[PDB]
Amino acid sequence: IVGGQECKDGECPWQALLINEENEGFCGGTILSEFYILTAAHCLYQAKRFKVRVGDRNTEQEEGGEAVHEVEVVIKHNRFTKETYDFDIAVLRLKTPITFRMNVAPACLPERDWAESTLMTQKTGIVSGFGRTHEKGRQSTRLKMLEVPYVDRNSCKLSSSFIITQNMFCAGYDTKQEDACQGDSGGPHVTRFKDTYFVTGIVSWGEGCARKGKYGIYTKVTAFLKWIDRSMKT
């Protein structure tokens, strides 16, 4: 996350971190329930074997709430392709259930029509993760969050060098130096409504980080709500 603020105690409890064999984070995820994590399908190509860490805010210390979980089943959307980045979504079933506690809790999955008419029409959403703090730097050792305005879809398409499909949406800033970045992909985009945070996107891709005239591109979770529900029942 470029710009934004640290997540303070309890503020981003649905954040998950995919960690490789070296115990290093490479992608984020969102806790949906005691057994399921939402992430991006492209993240599945960044590590041969990985586990999921939850409840972490500082990768350098041990605040006692951290828990590592092995993945039992990887459910990758059958239409994802590196060529278009369309259908960039996957769900992970864990081997053991997550124990909710301080800094560990699920984000709510909304209903499709209501999410499109009421959540995605709000001014902003919140993106979070342990990704780079500048396009050229190292991953953050601290979990960060950033308020990101929803971007008009026409403007989004005009700004992009690649096709923005119906399974994608734009969020962020035209020139302000704030955006998700490398290491944040797969992580949560949530929208607050009356003090309740709903899953609205998955950090997917961007032409660099916080570039002028470019925005962050998110998987549209509302397009996959039935697919997610089906994935969680098996």
Added chain:
Amino acid sequence: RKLCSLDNGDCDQFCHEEQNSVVCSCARGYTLADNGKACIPTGPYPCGKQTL
């Protein structure tokens, strides 16, 4: 603006318009309150709440 378009039909969470009236509902792990508008967590660590 009317019904769900007017302040979310006074619902805490989901709002649907059925037979020209507002119908509220809630996410999994919440139960609709007796007023049919508020959402009450059924147990601990309900989805979407910061753990403060």
